[PDB]
Design an enzyme around this catalytic site. Structure first.
Site, short mmCIF file in Angstrom:
data_model
loop_
_atom_site.label_atom_id
_atom_site.label_comp_id
_atom_site.label_asym_id
_atom_site.label_seq_id
_atom_site.Cartn_x
_atom_site.Cartn_y
_atom_site.Cartn_z
N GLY A 1 1.94 4.23 15.84
CA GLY A 1 1.94 5.47 16.40
C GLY A 1 1.53 5.65 17.87
O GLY A 1 1.25 6.89 18.48
N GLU B 1 -5.47 -5.16 10.37
CA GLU B 1 -4.44 -4.00 10.79
C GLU B 1 -4.33 -3.83 12.23
O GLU B 1 -5.64 -3.45 12.78
CB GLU B 1 -4.91 -2.71 10.08
CG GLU B 1 -4.80 -2.78 8.64
CD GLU B 1 -5.17 -1.35 8.37
OE1 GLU B 1 -6.45 -1.03 7.81
OE2 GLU B 1 -4.38 -0.45 8.32
N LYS C 1 0.10 4.24 -0.23
CA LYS C 1 -0.76 5.38 0.45
C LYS C 1 -0.50 6.56 -0.34
O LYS C 1 -0.59 6.52 -1.62
CB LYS C 1 -0.11 5.51 1.56
CG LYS C 1 -0.29 4.11 2.65
CD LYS C 1 -0.07 4.57 4.22
CE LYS C 1 -0.29 3.11 5.24
NZ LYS C 1 -0.02 3.58 6.44
N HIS D 1 -9.77 0.37 4.74
CA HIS D 1 -8.28 0.49 5.59
C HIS D 1 -8.58 1.36 6.68
O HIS D 1 -9.36 2.47 6.70
CB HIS D 1 -7.55 1.06 4.26
CG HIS D 1 -6.07 1.25 4.78
ND1 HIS D 1 -5.64 2.22 5.84
CD2 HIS D 1 -5.05 0.60 4.74
CE1 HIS D 1 -4.37 2.19 6.01
NE2 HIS D 1 -3.88 1.17 5.38
N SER E 1 3.15 -3.81 11.36
CA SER E 1 4.49 -3.35 11.11
C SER E 1 5.46 -4.64 10.34
O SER E 1 5.24 -5.60 11.06
CB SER E 1 5.11 -2.75 12.05
OG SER E 1 6.63 -2.51 11.77
N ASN F 1 0.88 -0.91 0.00
CA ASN F 1 0.13 0.20 -0.05
C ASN F 1 0.74 1.21 -0.01
O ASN F 1 1.34 1.55 0.91
CB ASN F 1 -0.81 0.11 1.30
CG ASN F 1 -1.80 1.20 1.28
OD1 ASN F 1 -1.89 1.74 0.34
ND2 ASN F 1 -2.22 1.40 2.47
N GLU G 1 -7.03 4.03 7.73
CA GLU G 1 -6.91 5.52 7.38
C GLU G 1 -8.52 5.86 7.02
O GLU G 1 -8.79 6.93 7.12
CB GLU G 1 -6.04 5.76 6.43
CG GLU G 1 -4.50 5.63 7.22
CD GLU G 1 -3.55 5.27 6.20
OE1 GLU G 1 -3.50 5.68 5.19
OE2 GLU G 1 -2.63 4.85 6.78
#
Lengths: 245, 246
Positions: free
Chosen positions: A168, A162, A10, A92, A208, A8, A94
């Site tokens: 983060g 995911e 992005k 996704h 990750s 991906n 996001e």
């Protein structure tokens, strides 16, 4: 289950950089046992499909739920197929959390994309707060159910987990906890769809992944590949494609 | 002295086949002297459209995000738009605001970033039926325009597009007179809140329902400097609208 590795990209890259990237991938040898898919920014789907070796498939990073209409800024599975792309990433993290794609809308996009003959990389995953509250299963099973309710042929679907709670947030997902989740999802499929579907459906890891950790992650019983983020823009992506090798 | 501006928003319509035919028609069409023509194809076709379309026709993106690169799956940046040959971006379209939830704050940041990246911006504003009903048309379009204005340092590359959302699929039908009324008020807002120079040079285009049968009268309105065409941009009729001032 054929090893699946999706990159991906992005919202990154331009024709120059993406062209170089594609050049690097075309020159690499992809194990016949691995299905590789690249997800370029929407403006470069056409570009990528033209430069990428036909052995590698192209996926759109999102799409809408109807064939055409007054939806300025959106694209349909039809346009994606029209550009030579054969997959579309839906749900996704996001899109869900940054652009507010509702669970209901995700289900509709899945139904429409598959109806249009496109393959779907359906993403699911719980946030840190949900994880903390100990409701991981609740969240991912609810998300997987919506997908399942909208899939008539799983042969064209790949589930991507995911671990959003590890993005983060300071938390670090171990391969053990990834396996833990993938096994539960496959168990949900086994009970709610069918044994055949649970056995053949690829459940790829969207957490990750680097060339130094792909081997161990890929060795997990229920991890059938990866939905790679940052690494998909670097040479390291080839190492991940060879995680099984 | 404002160059007549006609933008065709194909929205989420078309395939290489249909688009290529529409493009063939445009390449062979004669664009009027003091006129500027722009086409906004679906995002997956920006590249394709720029390649087939003759340079006499500019290409616009239908939307973009507020930063150059990043973890924003499904989005494209002004940098990518320019990279594909496009020179404009439509921002704040009624659909992005009301169907996809683009907030005025987000739109302001997108406007700021697109302009900083050297892209031209077609900034859309418009009030809904209920807002129209309550008689707050001016309050609404003024608020939206101010957000845009607050993020515009140089208006040379900005075109304002008024979208009478209130009429669009509501059983209503905006008349050229009510179109002129709003445009005049918008230009008055620019004069009073930005500068008389910006007010006189900024194109304010009509983004309501426009057809070859109604473009003439709409184009004649003093403060209507062109159109952001919707459904008509998909048919031969588009060429007639480009010639609305002829």
């Amino acid at each position: 289950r054929k090893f699946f590795v999706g990159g991906n990209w992005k919202m990154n890259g331009r024709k120059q950089s993406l062209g170089e990237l594609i050049g690097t991938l075309n020159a690499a040898k992809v194990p016949a046992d691995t299905e590789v898919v690249c997800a370029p920014p929407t403006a470069y789907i056409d570009f990528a499909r033209q430069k990428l070796d036909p052995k590698i498939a192209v996926a759109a990073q999102n799409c809408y739920k109807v064939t055409n209409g007054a939806f300025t800024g959106e694209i349909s599975p039809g346009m994606i197929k029209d550009c030579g792309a054969t997959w579309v990433v839906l749900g996704h993290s996001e899109r869900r959390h940054v652009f507010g794609d509702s669970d209901e809308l995700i289900g509709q996009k899945v139904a429409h994309a598959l109806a249009e003959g496109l393959g779907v990389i359906a993403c699911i995953g719980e946030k840190l707060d949900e994880r903390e509250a100990g409701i991981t299963e609740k969240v991912v099973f609810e998300q997987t159910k919506v997908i399942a309710d909208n899939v008539k042929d799983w042969s064209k679907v790949v589930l991507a987990y995911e671990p959003v709670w590890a993005i983060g947030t300071g938390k670090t997902a171990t391969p053990q906890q990834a396996q833990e989740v993938h096994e539960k999802l496959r168990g949900w499929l086994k009970s709610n769809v069918s044994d055949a579907v649970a056995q053949s459906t690829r459940i790829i890891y969207g957490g990750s992944v680097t060339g130094a950790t792909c081997k161990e992650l890929a060795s997990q019983p229920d991890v059938d590949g990866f939905l790679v983020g940052g690494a998909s823009l670097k040479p390291e992506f080839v190492d991940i494609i060879n995680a099984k090798q």
